[PDB]
Structure 1
Amino acid sequence: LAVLKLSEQGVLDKLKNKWWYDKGECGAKDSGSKEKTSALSLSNVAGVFY
């Protein structure tokens, strides 16, 4: 009864989000979209401006 009580009150949600992430601080999904490099951005051709 205690396990079913902790899950519906989001305690198992809260204890998950705390221990895996606050003792984390590495970045998550920093790449993101694969089409971020679709537009040929300035860092690709900044040498021509140099």
Structure 2
Amino acid sequence: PKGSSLGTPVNLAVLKLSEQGLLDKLKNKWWYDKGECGAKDSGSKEKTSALSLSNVAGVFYILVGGLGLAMLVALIEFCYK
């Protein structure tokens, strides 16, 4: 309240708390420490550069599929002969 007795005292108190790092400490206590997410933040510390295996994988399956098809065509050939 304007012209209060607690005016000046509280003002200085806030400055004192901040300089003692008590304010920063309190925030860390309720925001990060008491937080539930240091996991999505530890992974956000870094994601890396280049290409994936996903796309290339699709071409691997079509390869093995072709090999299997050949292993099938091979067996039948020896059978007819």
Report the alpha carbon displacement of residue 47 of structure 1 after superposing the two structures with TM: 5.3
Ranges of 4+ aligned residues in structure 1 off by more than 3 Å: 27-38, 41-49
Question: Which of 46, 57, 68 is equivalent to 1:46?
Answer: 57
Q: Residues 41 and 28 from structure 1, CA distance in 2 versus in 1: closer, same or farther, beyond 3 angstroms?
A: same
**Larger-gyration structure (1/2):** 2
How many aligned positions are there?
A: 49
Stretches of structure 2 lacking an aligned partner (at least 5 in a row): 1-11, 61-81
Report the alpha carbon displacement of residue 44 of structure 1 after superposing the two structures with TM: 5.4
Report the alpha carbon displacement of residue 23 of structure 1 after superposing the two structures with TM: 2.0
Q: Deviations over 1:8-45 (max 9, x none)?
A: 11000100101111221214764977994531134554
Q: Residues 31 and 24 from structure 1, CA distance in 2 versus in 1: closer, same or farther, beyond 3 angstroms?
A: closer
Q: Give the structure-1-normalised TM-score.
A: 0.56
Q: Residues 23 and 12 from structure 1, CA distance in 2 versus in 1: closer, same or farther, beyond 3 angstroms?
A: same
Which structure's residues are more often helix, by fraction? 2
Q: Residues 31 and 41 from structure 1, CA distance in 2 versus in 1: closer, same or farther, beyond 3 angstroms?
A: farther
Question: Which of 29, 32, 38 is equivalent to 1:27?
Answer: 38
Stretches of structure 1 lacking an aligned partner (at least 5 in a row): none
